[PDB]
Amino acid sequence: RWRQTWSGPGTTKRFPETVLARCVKYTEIHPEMRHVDCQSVWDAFKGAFISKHPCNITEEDYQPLMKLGTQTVPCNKILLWSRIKDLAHQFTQVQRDMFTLEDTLLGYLADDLTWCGEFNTSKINYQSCPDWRKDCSNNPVSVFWKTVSRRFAEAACDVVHVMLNGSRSKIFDKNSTFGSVEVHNLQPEKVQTLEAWVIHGGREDSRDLCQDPTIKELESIISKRNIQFSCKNIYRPDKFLQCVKNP
């Protein structure tokens, strides 16, 4: 009876039923993951935020889920992406030997969902959840993503690719999961190169977007961490998939 109203949307209706179904479907499509017990999964997921104040979630709260969700992703086939969701995923849907975070079990379970609980209650708060900006950054959803993202990045090796959106005011935005957590967690010991793919999209007349001020900045950040940088313009997205789809 002490529920505060938050500024963000409440938990996605049917969140529990959705996570379970997604876990079931996932293990169905990935036989290599059949060893996973989806009820345990949901339990560990739920345990990270239920009965807890939605502004004091920590990485450790998700550790049990992280363990039950351990998954071996060929480290040299990782595709990071920033604000270009749809194309990043149409890509791994074709080039199935490449993987984005949302292609892993955990990423698949939480994709496009919102959730939060309430202190000293077993109820899922469907009324409202903390908005990271207006309420607090350490809410169930944000903490979850920065945690799984950081782990995904840390596991990368060799050549890591990042899909970026050329149509954006800031093709490379420091203020984004990519720029604030993934790029700073790629290991120099494992990763030698970070290759960006800037996707063109009508923003302007065709030109070299790999010379963009934000891209130069990305290269600065990356180079500083002793990792080589490479950038490639993907001028015709439609022609891109097509050539990946029918080589």
UniProtKB/Swiss-Prot annotation:
MF (Gene Ontology): identical protein binding; NAD+ nucleosidase activity, cyclic ADP-ribose generating; phosphorus-oxygen lyase activity; transferase activity
Membrane-side (Extracellular) residue stretches: 1-247
Enzyme Commission no: 3.2.2.-, 3.2.2.6, 2.4.99.20
Subcellular compartments: Cell surface; Membrane
Topology of the protein relative to the lipid bilayer: Single-pass type II membrane protein
Primary localisation category: other
pH dependence text: Optimum pH for NAADP(+) production is 5.0 from either substrate, activity is much higher at pH 5.0 than 7.4.
Glycosylation sites: 56, 120, 165, 175
Domain of life: Eukaryota
Effect of mutating residue 157 to E: Loss of cADPR hydrolase activity
GO BP, sorted A to Z: apoptotic signaling pathway; artery smooth muscle contraction; B cell proliferation; B cell receptor signaling pathway; female pregnancy; long-term synaptic depression; NAD metabolic process; negative regulation of apoptotic process
Gene Ontology cellular-component terms listed: basolateral plasma membrane; cell surface; extracellular exosome; membrane; nuclear membrane; plasma membrane
SS bond list: 23-38, 55-136, 116-129, 210-231
Catalyzed reaction equations: 2'-phospho-cyclic ADP-ribose + nicotinate = nicotinate-adenine dinucleotide phosphate; NAD(+) = cyclic ADP-beta-D-ribose + nicotinamide + H(+); NAD(+) + H2O = ADP-D-ribose + nicotinamide + H(+); cyclic ADP-beta-D-ribose + H2O = ADP-D-ribose
Notes on activation and inhibition: ATP inhibits the cADPR hydrolyzing activity.
Quaternary structure (record): Homodimer.
Family of this protein: Belongs to the ADP-ribosyl cyclase family.
Note: A cell surface antigen recognized in lymophocytes by multiple mAbs.
Described function: Synthesizes cyclic ADP-ribose (cADPR), a second messenger for glucose-induced insulin secretion. Synthesizes the Ca(2+) mobilizer nicotinate-adenine dinucleotide phosphate, NAADP(+), from 2'-phospho-cADPR and nicotinic acid, as well as from NADP(+) and nicotinic acid. At both pH 5.0 and pH 7.4 preferentially transforms 2'-phospho-cADPR into NAADP(+), while preferentially cleaving NADP(+) to cADPR and ADPRP rather than into NADDP(+). Has cADPR hydrolase activity.
Name of the protein: ADP-ribosyl cyclase/cyclic ADP-ribose hydrolase 1
Span of the entire protein shown here: 45 to 291 of 300
